[PDB]
Design a protein around this ligand. Structure first.
Ligand SMILES: *[C@@H]1O[C@H](CO)[C@@H](O)[C@H](O)[C@H]1NC(C)=O
Ligand SMILES: *[C@@H]1O[C@H](CO)[C@@H](O)[C@H](O)[C@H]1NC(C)=O
Lengths: 533, 536
């Protein structure tokens, strides 16, 4: 079992108090999204715009802003239902561009979810309100997912005021209004939706939920990745009518090997598809259970490894007192459940309504796969145990350093501790993943509660925006400033962003000179023939 | 899920180095036993006697000594046995008094375990040798158990030089030589025996072993409390010839509740029967798995609940790929398996051989109970999670304080640290457990002269207000209270909340064991009220 690595460098508040924050009267940060050279930040009643080329002086000021508050009658209705007015606000929870000019923005609107269209360049409300049912949650403490694929919006949230109908929904475009089965613990059980990606012929979802492979034990939570077809048209007139015909979910296996594997089963966040040395990869942050000893880790799963688990066996529970087992291959119907029509094995079907009742009623009671998704190298890329907090947010620089052939990973924490890790992704690389720097990003004087929410890499401007429930802080990716001319300090920090120069000092690799001009040893860090400055 | 408490006070080295250490080429400590005011320390080749009435001046000086080095041919045969010369020594692994005059002593003898009888008064070889097979281990690095109950000795160890046949065994009596079924993975699978206790009509064993219920999952480790009957003599000629007809084992449940129970199932050490709040309980140290996040806890189980667990239903695996579930109460054969003959539900059967064969062949294929022994007061009595090390040894003072109504637990560690914890036992007591002091015990100057500082065992010298922390090469006498650390500062006194210390009108607070009336010592062990007390 690994041990907590020692941070090669630390950055306390006093070393980070010299950094600008955003407040804008609570911010109530909900999400953020970067397009080209502009970062939108969605909180309570407002959506701010920040020019990433505008380098701040006193404080990052919003270039523009979007105002949309709940009409007073909405607030009075939210009060009549019996919820406190602090929740009776229009917390912007959905902000997804449909094309290169308009954006779909959904807010909770005092527990009456609504949706509108705005223009990106001018933040102009051009149009009117689409209802927000099954697209924006009623509560701001919930998570939610919203994605656009070929014109159709795939959402994931709750659809009722009582917060009981957790659902994956799809609408808009030129298809049909599909959804999961209401109150069907076999399909999804008290989940917390996190992320979603569009790959191949499918759209994958990433969430966590109460596990049914542990129903004889406790209410343990597993990490699931679900999958649906883009061209899903629905079930036949008697089976799966107005429901999904390819909803397949599998388990993600973030574990430490040995004689008794240790599993990080709770998922806190994940990235999009990142090209990590030739192959597409998704990198997730997994902590342990609630009532457990807080430990966290960072696993990475490939997209071929995730497509294979769905090409595998299904999982069933024959008797109520038997262990969940794999369904034999000669007992699964035809065509191959989960395959999309007009593709591969189901190419003899042009619509999902022509699907037989043999296959559609099978996937209705066997939606869980048998295999679990293994990570690469079969061991996490980083872990953190001996501390009192859990890691949350995540972002990755796939190309770091002068030759941009190194991967860096930035993770959040429940206590505003953003960790920067040089990660090992290939056999021929390091010996272990090196925690380069540990930063205290929370700004008690500037902010206000110190749980990192999300991280946004600004690679071109060499920055990382760290989110909290009341502030966003711009932290430089590097800190070669503090090592200065102490050539040791810089080489012994092993930072790929920092490079030493003949001019007698060590600075960022994004300065202007050739890659060969910078000198460093991020691999080993050979301190030979040097002095303690 | 709670969190680690903060030490009210910490005793560092440069304070603890003002304490005497015992040293007796190393020592290779193995065990220690307290008889009245005498302590027997058993290590390699030798057995030391120290008088708990002799206040040390510079070093713990042993009074009497017993020597027992191995045979000349047992050094060089053990040389032929591949074993290193350091391993080829007579490590005393068993030292148990049979009566109040002589003692059974078993040693490894360079992987040729043998037993003898000595006299406590003289430590003289006043007997003749006995073979230590199934009684004393071949290897010193392993654990073992030995106990005398009703004339006979009940051992539990390994029996072969290759360390494969683990066995619970009985001898030194009028019957034959009973033992567990060798290689029966459903009876015993790779265990580490830790303790045994005679209670009622049974001898209960306490150990840990690879779980049979995690056959599908990983090689987990479950903590087992087993039990055998004392009047057992074996089965009939047909089934279980020269074997136990009452071997019943249950699982120990050290659990933090909630929507996802957190379990400590690796047993490290345990105590004997201690009367807590009126009922006999047993207190034990559990830790998480090896390949897990290091955490540890202190749980307490009442004997009544253990018996209620053993009077319950058995556990079976109906299908290879199914969950272990209970056996119906109509399918349990008569007489009640596990019950001792001449008692309760076997009052008619006068001997375990009069038993049938369906009952035996049932108890032969169902040695594992279904229920798990619940811990007292749901959540564990103590927890330690954020540290890099695991707890080990355990000792308990059940009558701390000037009124002797407080339970103070001392727990070892893998890094020479000892934790003193006033435990919350009954509801109408504390709010939660209070770890008063954290004592660094390992003495780098004396305890070594290689750096391994694993606490092995502890012994409570309540009659002399001490605690002999044991290591692999030293024993450190450690008082139960440094009431001198506070003295003048009433704030520091009531702030440590130690029941061993109390405040006096003389302006200095002291050990409550000084000879004055109980109503004279002022303290507040229920809250820690530093109100209206100046910061001295
Ligand atoms: C998790 O992955 C490891 C290696 O990738 C594998 O050995 C282990 O069996 C997996 N566990 C499960 C439950 O699939
Ligand atoms: C441990 O004991 C608690 C009650 O103290 C009980 O709820 C739990 O189920 C027990 N654990 C097992 C594995 O039976």
């Amino acid at each position: 079992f690994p041990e907590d690595d020692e941070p090669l460098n630390t950055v306390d508040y006093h070393y980070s108090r010299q950094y600008p924050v955003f407040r804008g009267h609570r911010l109530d940060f909900q999400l953020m999204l970067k397009i080209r050279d502009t970062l939108y930040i969605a909180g309570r009643d407002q959506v701010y715009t920040v020019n990433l080329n505008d380098i701040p002086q006193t404080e990052v000021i919003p270039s523009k802003k979007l105002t949309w508050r709940s009409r007073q009658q909405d607030r009075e209705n939210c009060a009549m239902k019996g919820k406190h007015k602090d929740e009776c606000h229009n917390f912007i929870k959905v902000f997804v561009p449909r094309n290169d000019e308009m954006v779909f923005v959904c807010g909770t609107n005092a527990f009456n979810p609504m949706c509108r269209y705005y223009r990106l360049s001018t933040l102009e409300y051009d149009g009117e309100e689409i209802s927000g049912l099954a697209r924006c949650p009623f509560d701001a403490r919930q998570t939610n997912v919203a994605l656009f694929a070929d014109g159709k919006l795939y959402s994931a949230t709750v659809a009722d005021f009582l917060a009981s109908d957790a659902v994956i929904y799809r609408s808009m475009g030129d298809g049909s209004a599909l959804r999961t089965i209401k109150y069907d613990s076999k399909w999804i059980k008290e989940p917390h939706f996190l992320h979603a990606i569009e790959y191949g012929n499918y759209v994958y979802f990433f969430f966590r939920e109460i596990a049914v492979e542990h129903n004889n034990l406790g209410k343990a939570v597993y990490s699931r990745v679900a999958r649906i077809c883009k061209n899903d048209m629905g079930g036949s007139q008697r089976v799966l009518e107005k429901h999904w015909t390819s909803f397949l979910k599998a388990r993600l296996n973030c574990s430490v090997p040995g004689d008794s594997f240790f599993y990080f089963d709770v998922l806190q966040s994940i990235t999009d598809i990142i090209q990590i040395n030739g192959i597409p990869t998704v990198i997730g942050v997994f902590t342990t259970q609630l009532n457990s000893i807080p430990g966290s880790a960072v696993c990475a799963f490939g997209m071929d490894d995730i497509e294979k688990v769905f090409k595998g066996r299904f999982k069933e529970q024959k008797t109520p007192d038997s262990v969940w087992t794999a369904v034999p291959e000669d007992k699964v119907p035809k065509p191959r459940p989960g395959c999309c029509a007009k593709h591969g094995l189901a190419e003899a079907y042009k619509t999902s309504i022509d699907f037989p009742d043999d296959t559609l009623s099978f996937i209705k009671s066997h939606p869980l796969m048998d295999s679990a998704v293994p990570p690469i190298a079969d061991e996490p890329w980083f872990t953190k145990t001996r501390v009192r907090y859990r890691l949350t947010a995540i972002e990755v620089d796939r190309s770091a350093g002068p030759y941009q052939n190194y991967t860096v990973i930035f993770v959040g924490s429940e206590a505003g501790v953003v960790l920067k890790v040089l990660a090992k992704t290939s056999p021929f690389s390091l010996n272990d993943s090196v925690l380069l720097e540990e930063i205290e990003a929370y700004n008690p004087a500037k902010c206000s509660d110190r749980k990192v929410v999300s991280l946004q890499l600004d690679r071109d401007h060499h920055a990382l925006y760290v989110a909290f429930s009341s502030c966003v802080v711009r932290i430089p990716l590097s800190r070669c400033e503090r090592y200065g001319s102490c050539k040791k300090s810089c080489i012994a920090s092993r930072d790929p962003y920092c490079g030493w120069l003949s001019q007698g000092v060590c600075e960022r690799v994004t300065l202007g000179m050739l890659a060969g001009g910078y000198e460093q040893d991020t691999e080993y860090g050979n301190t030979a023939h040097l002095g303690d400055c």
